[PDB]
Design a protein around this motif. Sequence first.
Motif, PDB file in Angstrom:
ATOM      1  N   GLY C 175       0.810  -1.201   0.000  1.00 22.42           N
ATOM      2  CA  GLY C 175       0.000   0.000   0.000  1.00 22.42           C
ATOM      3  C   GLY C 175       0.846   1.255   0.000  1.00 22.42           C
ATOM      4  O   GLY C 175       0.785   2.061   0.933  1.00 22.42           O
ATOM      5  N   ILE C 176       1.638   1.425  -1.048  1.00 26.15           N
ATOM      6  CA  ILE C 176       2.609   2.507  -1.134  1.00 26.15           C
ATOM      7  C   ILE C 176       1.914   3.748  -1.681  1.00 26.15           C
ATOM      8  O   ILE C 176       0.934   3.646  -2.429  1.00 26.15           O
ATOM      9  CB  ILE C 176       3.803   2.099  -2.016  1.00 26.15           C
ATOM     10  CG1 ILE C 176       5.112   2.585  -1.403  1.00 26.15           C
ATOM     11  CG2 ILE C 176       3.661   2.642  -3.430  1.00 26.15           C
ATOM     12  CD1 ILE C 176       5.446   1.888  -0.115  1.00 26.15           C
ATOM     13  N   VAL C 177       2.385   4.920  -1.263  1.00 28.59           N
ATOM     14  CA  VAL C 177       1.967   6.169  -1.895  1.00 28.59           C
ATOM     15  C   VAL C 177       2.883   6.409  -3.092  1.00 28.59           C
ATOM     16  O   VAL C 177       4.048   6.782  -2.926  1.00 28.59           O
ATOM     17  CB  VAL C 177       2.011   7.344  -0.913  1.00 28.59           C
ATOM     18  CG1 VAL C 177       1.458   8.598  -1.567  1.00 28.59           C
ATOM     19  CG2 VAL C 177       1.226   7.010   0.342  1.00 28.59           C
ATOM     20  N   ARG C 178       2.361   6.188  -4.302  1.00 25.78           N
ATOM     21  CA  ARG C 178       3.195   6.277  -5.498  1.00 25.78           C
ATOM     22  C   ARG C 178       3.755   7.680  -5.683  1.00 25.78           C
ATOM     23  O   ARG C 178       4.944   7.854  -5.974  1.00 25.78           O
ATOM     24  CB  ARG C 178       2.396   5.857  -6.731  1.00 25.78           C
ATOM     25  CG  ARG C 178       1.460   4.687  -6.513  1.00 25.78           C
ATOM     26  CD  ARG C 178       1.813   3.537  -7.440  1.00 25.78           C
ATOM     27  NE  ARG C 178       2.120   3.996  -8.789  1.00 25.78           N
ATOM     28  CZ  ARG C 178       1.301   3.886  -9.824  1.00 25.78           C
ATOM     29  NH1 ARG C 178       0.106   3.332  -9.704  1.00 25.78           N
ATOM     30  NH2 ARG C 178       1.691   4.342 -11.012  1.00 25.78           N
ATOM     31  N   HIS C 179       2.913   8.694  -5.518  1.00 25.99           N
ATOM     32  CA  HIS C 179       3.310  10.084  -5.712  1.00 25.99           C
ATOM     33  C   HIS C 179       3.458  10.741  -4.345  1.00 25.99           C
ATOM     34  O   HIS C 179       2.465  10.982  -3.653  1.00 25.99           O
ATOM     35  CB  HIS C 179       2.289  10.814  -6.580  1.00 25.99           C
ATOM     36  CG  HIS C 179       1.828  10.018  -7.759  1.00 25.99           C
ATOM     37  ND1 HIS C 179       2.660   9.693  -8.808  1.00 25.99           N
ATOM     38  CD2 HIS C 179       0.623   9.475  -8.053  1.00 25.99           C
ATOM     39  CE1 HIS C 179       1.987   8.987  -9.699  1.00 25.99           C
ATOM     40  NE2 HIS C 179       0.749   8.842  -9.265  1.00 25.99           N
ATOM     41  N   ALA C 180       4.704  11.031  -3.961  1.00 24.88           N
ATOM     42  CA  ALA C 180       4.962  11.600  -2.644  1.00 24.88           C
ATOM     43  C   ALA C 180       4.407  13.012  -2.515  1.00 24.88           C
ATOM     44  O   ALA C 180       4.129  13.466  -1.401  1.00 24.88           O
ATOM     45  CB  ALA C 180       6.462  11.593  -2.353  1.00 24.88           C
TER      46      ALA C 180
END
Lengths: 289, 298, 494, 212, 109
Positions: C175-180
Motif C-alpha cells: 500500500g505505497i503512496v506512489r506520488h509523494a
Amino acid sequence: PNYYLYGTVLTRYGLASLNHDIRRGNKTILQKGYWNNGKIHSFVGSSAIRWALRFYLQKQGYLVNRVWDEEEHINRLTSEDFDPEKFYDDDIFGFALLESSTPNQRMGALGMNMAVSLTPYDGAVKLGAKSGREKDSTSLHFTEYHATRYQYYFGIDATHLKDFSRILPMIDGIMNLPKVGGSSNIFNYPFCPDSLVFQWTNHFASYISYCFEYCDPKSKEAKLSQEFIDEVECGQIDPSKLWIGGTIVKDLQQLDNFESSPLNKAHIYRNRNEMIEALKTVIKRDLGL
Amino acid sequence: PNYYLYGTVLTRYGLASLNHDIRRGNKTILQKGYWNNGKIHSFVGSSAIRWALRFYLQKQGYLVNRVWDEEEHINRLTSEDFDPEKFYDDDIFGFALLESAETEEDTSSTPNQRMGALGMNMAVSLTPYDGAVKLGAKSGREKDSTSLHFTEYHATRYQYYFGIDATHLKDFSRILPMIDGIMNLPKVGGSSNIFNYPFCPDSLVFQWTNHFASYISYCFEYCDPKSKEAKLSQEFIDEVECGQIDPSKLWIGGTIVKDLQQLDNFESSPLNKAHIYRNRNEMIEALKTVIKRDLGLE
Amino acid sequence: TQPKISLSLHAADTTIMHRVGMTGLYMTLKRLEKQYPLSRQRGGHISWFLTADTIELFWEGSDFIALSWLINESFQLDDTGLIHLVGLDNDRIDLRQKIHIHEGICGVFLRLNKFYQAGEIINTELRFEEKQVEYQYKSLTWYAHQTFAEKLCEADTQQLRHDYIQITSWLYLGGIVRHARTQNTTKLEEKPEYALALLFVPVVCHYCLLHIPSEDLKERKPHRYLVVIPEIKDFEDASQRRWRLQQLETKQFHVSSLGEAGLLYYSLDDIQPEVAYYQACQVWLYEKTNKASRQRTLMSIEEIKIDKNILITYQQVQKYFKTNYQIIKYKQIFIKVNPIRSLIADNLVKGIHWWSNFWEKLVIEDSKEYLFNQLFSNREGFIIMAENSEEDKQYLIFIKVFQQAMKGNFAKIYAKTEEGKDPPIKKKVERLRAELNYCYDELSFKEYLSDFLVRGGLNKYFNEHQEEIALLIKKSPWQEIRIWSLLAIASYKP
Amino acid sequence: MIAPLILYLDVPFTTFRESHAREMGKTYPVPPPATVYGMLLSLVGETNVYRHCGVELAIAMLSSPKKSRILRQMRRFKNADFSHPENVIPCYQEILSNLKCLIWVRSDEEKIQPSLRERIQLAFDHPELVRRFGCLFLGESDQLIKTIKLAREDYLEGVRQWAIRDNRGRLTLPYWVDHVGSRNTRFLRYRIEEMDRLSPPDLAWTMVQSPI
Amino acid sequence: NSEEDKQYLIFIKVFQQAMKGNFAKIYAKTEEGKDPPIKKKVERLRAELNYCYDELSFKEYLSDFLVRGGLNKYFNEHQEEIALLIKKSPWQEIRIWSLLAIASYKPKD
C-alpha cells in the motif's frame, strides 16, 4: 543533417577459434548458437571487434584514453575522467563510470552487432597434446575450430561524434582491422574485410544488416542474399547511397541483366581501397570536413 | 468523423538484446513472458518504442516539450505547463500533471491531462526464446570483479502493434512525422554497443479506417523456432476472407508482399484488392496521400 | 447487545490481507481469553464472541480505552526487546525462532524508522554443539502496532471513527503512496475494523529467507525475505495450521525457491483421503534494490495453489531428500539449503515435471561442484522420486539403460587400472558430466549418448525394451534426455 | 425482454492492476467490472462516468491467460523538478497474454435513455457516427484491443469460465474505482467456475452503481 | 507409430539381423578355442562405425556390412522404404540408428 554509415562486412575464408566461451572440462568450446533456418552457427562477439578498433586507434598514434600495454597485458587510463572531446576512444566507443561536472557516461557513436559465421558449425575439433612422455593432467586437450567466413553489422552516428573528422580513422580501422581476440598462435584468422555493403544516408532506416548468404551449406561461396537484391530492385534502397566492394563485385557483375538492374548504378568497386577513397570523399563533402 | 491509423510492423532478422530485465549475478536477463501456445517470447516494452519515437521527433527539429539531454542522460522539460497545441511531444504522446492524480475529473481551467493520441502495444519476438547468453570478460591480466558478465540475446524478428486516433491530434498534420518516425525508427532502447538491432520495418499491414476496431494487431507469425520466414497468420487471412477488415482499407508492404504474391489463388483472393506495394516508400507515399485527402491536410 | 466491531470472512469487500488479519485477531483473542478468563479483568470489560468465520467485539465505556487495552496486550515487547505477539504461543517457541520472527517483521512490515524506535544491539551467545554463537539483533522500544489505537479513535471524543482511515505500507503490504507530492490525498483508506484486521495481519503470515545460489552462502549472508500469506478458509483451520507450523525448526525456514517456502507453510498439514484437500497461498518477495538500499522493496508476488498430490509429493521429498545443513562458523550460523529440494518444490508448484530445470540449474550454474556433490547425497531421494513417479516409466527404463551403460564404461577402465591406480567414482563421473555438457545440439548429443551406450557393452534393459527406448531416444528432445542422464548419474549405485 | 448484448474481446496484453497493489503491479486474473465499464464508455465515447450507472455486465473467460512480469521505469510525482532522478522508479508490472472473453451487456436498470446497450449496438451498426477520442484499449492506454465485435452465445461454442459472485471467492474485483485514493472504491468477491453454459447464470451479473 | 518411426524400427531390425549374420560367420570361422569372443566383436563394430568420416565412406561400409549379414528378412519385406531411407537420410543419423541397434542387440542363446 543527421548522417549514418551502416555497413555489413564479410571476412575471408579460414580456420577460426576466436570465440571461446566457458570451457567444459577438457575441450575448449567456442561460442555458438542458433541462426538462419535452425542450424548452429559460431558467433564472434562485437566487443572483440570494438577492442580491435580501439587497438588500431592506439597503434596508429591517435590520442586514446585507454592505453593497452602489450607487454603487461593490462589496461591503463591516461585520464581518470573520461573526456570525449580530447580522446578518440571515449568519443567513439563511449564510456560508463559506475562507482560510488563532467558526464559519467556516453552513448558512443559506433554501434556494432555480433559477428556471425556464414556457414553453420559442423562440429570440427582439433586435438592438442604437449610433447614428451612425461604426461600429466594438463597433457592433452581439445580445441574447437570453424572453417567459415564471419560477417558482422555495424552502424555509425556521424553527427553523434564530438569531432566529425574522427569517422575516417574508424573506417580505416574497419578496413585495416588488427587481430580480433582469439587464438592467434594456432588459428591465425585475418579479420580484414573482403566484401562490403556500405550505406551512407541521412535516413535512419538500414536494410543491409547481414546481407550475405552461402550457396552451399559447407562451401566458401559467399553470394549476396536474394532479399537484399530484391530490395534493391524494388527501389527501397537508393543505389546512389549504396557502396559495394570486395570479391562480391565479380559475382554481382556476372549476374544476368546486371546492366539493366538498379544495382548497376550503385557505387561498385572491385578494389576496396578505391571504394573507401570514394566513400571518404563523399563523407568529407557531406560533413564539411 | 474519427479517423484511426492502425498498423502491425515486423522488424528485420538479427541479434537483439533490447529491453533487458533486472540483473541476476552476471546475467543481464532479457525480459520475456508467455505468448501464443504458451511459449516464452522476448518482449520489448511499449514505453521503449514510445521513447524511440520521442527521440526521433526531437532529433529532427519538431519542437518538443520533453527534451532528452544526451550529455547528462536525463530528461528535461522546456515548459512545466504542457501545451499540446505547440509541442509535438505533448500533442502525440500526451501528458499527466501533478493534479491529475489527486482528482477524478480531467480538468482543474487548464486541462489537467491529455490521453496520448498514439498507443502502441509491446513488441514481441516472432520466434520463441531459447536460452542464449554471451561471455563478457574484459581484457586485462587484472581480473577483479565487474568482469565475466553474461548478456542474454535473441536472434529473431520483433513485431509490434500501434494505433493513432488522427482526429484526436490537436494539429492533424502531425501524423505524417509520426509515420516517418515509425518507418525511420532510429533505435529502440538496448545494448546498441554490443547488439546493434535496427528497428526499421520490413513488413507492414496498415489500416486507415474510421472504425474504432482493427482486427490486424498481430498478423505475422511462423513460430517453428530458429527461423525467419515469418509468414502471414492464417487467422488474419481467414478474417479478411470472412468479410470484416475491408481490403480497400488495408495497406500491405515489405518483404511479405513477395510471399503474398507467390500464393496460389491470390489473384482471385479478397486480399488482392488491398493496397499492396513491395516498396515501403511507395506504399507510405500513397497512404500519406490518402491521409492528407481524408484529413484535409492539403 | 450490539457488537461495536463485527468482522466476517463472508464480507464481499474484503481482500486476502483482510481475512489474514481477521485470522490473526481470532488467534490473539483466543490467546487473550485463555490469559484473561474473566471479562472484568480485561480493560473496559471488552468481550468477544468467536465463531468459525465471524468475530464480534463488545466493550463498555470509552472505545479508546478498550481498543488501547486490546492492542497493547496484543503487541508487546519482552525484556530483551523482541517483538512479543501474544497471538503466538511464545512459551513453546524458542529464542532463535522468536528472533527470526522479530527480524522478519522488522524487515517486512516495519521497514521504516518512522514506525519503530530502535534500542541497543543486543548480543546473545547461545551454545550449539559445544559452540557459543553470538546472535546480534536490533532490539526495539516501540512500534506503530502498539500505538495504532490512537489512530483508530478520534482525538477529542475518544471514540471509534465513523470515516475511513488513511493507512500506509506498514499496515497493508504494497500500500505505497506512489506520488509523494500527493501524500494527503492519494493514500489507501480503510474502515476502522479492517484497519484493526490489517494491524493483526502479521500474526498469521510467516517469514522465510531466500538464498540465491549464484552467490556463495559463506561469502554473503541472505537478506531476501519471503512472506507467506495464506488464503483463509476457516479461522479454526488457519489458527491450527499456524500453531502447528510453530513446530518447525528455524533452519527449515531458509529456502532457495518460493515454491519450497509456500509448500513449507503447508508441509505439516495432515492429508485426509476422504476429504478433497485444496489450499492456496501467496508468497511475497522483499529484496533490496541495491547494496546501499535502506529498506527492502516488494519485487514479486507469486500465487501458489496446492492439491493433495502436490502436498504428498512435497512431503515425500522432505522426508527422503537431505535436510538443510547447519554450518557453524565464528558467531555465525550459515544454514546451507538443499538446492535439489528447492528446485523440486518449485517444479511441483509450477505444475511441470520435477526434473524440468535440473541441468542449467545444477551443472551450468555450479562453481566448484558445490551443487554437483549434493546429487550423490540426495541419491536416495532421487530413487524414491523416480520409483513413485506419477507417470512416465519409460524414462525410468531409460535410466536403467543409461546406468547399465555407465556401469560398463566405468568397469572397462576400472579393470584397466589396477589397485591403487583405480580412480574414484568422482573423477570418472566428473569427466562424464563434462562430456555431457560438451553436447550443444540434438545431433551431437544423440551421437555421444549412442556411442556411450554401445561402449557400455551388452545392455539387457535396452534389449528388453528395444522399440520403446529406441523411439524415446529418437523422438524426445535432447535436453530432456540430458537431464535424465544427469539424474541417472546421480542415482547410480556402484 | 430484449436479449442482452454480447461482445467478443481479444486483447494481446492486459494489466488489471489491483486496487491495493501500488508498490508492485499485481494484476487481476479477470478484467474487473469497473474496467469493462470504462472500456464500454470509451467505446461509446461517453466521458461522464455517472451517465450509465445501473448497467449489468457478465464476463465469460474463453481461455485462461498466462501471467508474466515485465520491468518498467515508471515515473511518479515525487519531486518538484521533472529531471530529478527520484521521479523514476523501476518496478515490475504483471501482464496477461492472449486474453479472449465474451462480455454480456444488460441495461434493464438504467434510468437514462438511450441505454448503454443501445449505444453500443448503434455504434457497431454505424461506426462512422461514433464521436470518440483516442484508441480503444483494455487496461493501460498502450494495451490496445485486437478484436472487439458483436457475437452470439456460441461464438467458439466451447466451454466457458464464468465469473460468479461468490462471497467465499478468491478474487476481489471492483465495480467502481476511486482513482484518487480508495474511499469510493466498491468491491465484490468473485470466483471462476468452469461452465460452458452459454448464457450467464444469475450470480454472474454485476451491476455498476455509484458508491453512494 | 508414424511411418518414419516404422521405417526406423525396420532399419534397426535390419541392422540387428546383419550383425547376427556377421557374428554367426565369425563363430563359424573361429570355432576353435573355449569360445569365440562376443564383446570384442561389438567393440570392433563400434570402432569401424566410428571410423567413418563422411557420407560416402559410411554408406559404403553400411552396405557392405548389410550384405555380409545375409538374408536379412526385414530387408526382404521392405526394399523400397529401407533403400530410400538409407539413400536419403544424413549419414550421421544412420550411424546413430546403427549404434542404437548395436546396443539393443540380443545374442542368440
